[PDB]
Amino acid sequence: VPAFLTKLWTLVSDPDTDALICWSPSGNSFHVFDQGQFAKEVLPKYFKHNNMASFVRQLNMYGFRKVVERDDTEFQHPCFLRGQEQLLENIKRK
Amino acid sequence: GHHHHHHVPAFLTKLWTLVSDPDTDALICWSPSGNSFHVFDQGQFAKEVLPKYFKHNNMASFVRQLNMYGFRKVVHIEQGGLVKPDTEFQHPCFLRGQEQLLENIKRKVT
DNA sequence: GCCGAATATTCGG
DNA sequence: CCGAATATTCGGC
Ligand code: NA
Ligand code: NA
């Protein structure tokens, strides 16, 4: 399992980051709140960059899709589900 | 991909700058003839120069890029009988004073 | 918003 | 030193 997916699983699931990135209440997706602060303050703790665009490129690379005031966004993957970490084994690049 | 109008990869301008910088010459510097550069104390160079220009502090990842762009280690014949107890790299188009040749250095494809 | 491609970083042969 | 896996960046719809 590539490092991006386990890092993404960790930082989404981490309660200490939920004001910036967190599971949706139903758990099929995750929200990103205040993309400016998230990109500069959260991304460099896990990756070699602080660009939201490079984070989104990786999401799309593994097949995540954007879910249709604040600068907030939401992404989903059919196999990126809260509580089901094992599904990551079969998430490959498209 | 790269720019449509003009392309000099970031590694080459960064390499030119950090080699030519007099503030780094105790760690990386041009040879006297200007046709190669030396790396002194690879450990200190990796911690002190590499993170200022790249997303890492690994000598191996710096050398990987050097080889990707066609640079080769310079080796020297050992003369004399006295025992002798620090590396050097060259590219035919990486020459001090012939700065425009840097533009003709292309990365390997893979 | 999503994907192709060149370059960058890491890991193993 | 090299090839590949993965990551980061650049630019096209
Ligand atoms: Na979180
Ligand atoms: Na120097």
Numbering used by the authors:
A (entry chain A): 15 to 82, 93 to 118
B (entry chain B): 8 to 92, 96 to 120
Lines quoted from the article behind this entry:
To address this question, we first determined two structures: HSF2-DBD (residues 7–112) bound to a 12-bp oligonucleotide and HSF1-DBD (residues 15–120) bound to a 14-bp oligonucleotide at resolutions 1.7 and 2.0 Å. All base pairs were well defined in electron density except for an invisible terminal pair present in the HSF1 structure. Similar to the reported structures containing tail-to-tail HSEs, all sequence-specific interactions occur in the major groove and are principally donated by the bidentate hydrogen bonds between an invariant Arg residue (Arg63 in HSF2 or Arg71 in HSF1) and the guanine in the GAA triplet. The dimerization is weakly maintained by contacts between the short turns present in the helix-turn-helix motif, where only one residue (Lys54 in HSF2 and Lys62 in HSF1) is involved in forming a 2-fold symmetric pair of hydrogen bonds. In comparison with HSF2, one HSF1 monomer slightly moved away along the DNA axis. The relative movement reflects a more extended binding manner of the HSF1 dimer, or in other words, HSF1 occupying a longer DNA segment than HSF2.
Heat shock factor 1 (HSF1) and 2 (HSF2) play distinct but overlapping regulatory roles in maintaining cellular proteostasis or mediating cell differentiation and development. Upon activation, both HSFs trimerize and bind to heat shock elements (HSEs) present in the promoter region of target genes. HSFs recognize and bind HSEs through the DBD, which is the most conserved and only structurally characterized domain. Here, we present co-crystal structures of human HSF1 and HSF2 trimers bound to DNA, which reveal a triangular arrangement of the three DNA-binding domains (DBDs) with protein-protein interactions largely mediated by the wing domain.
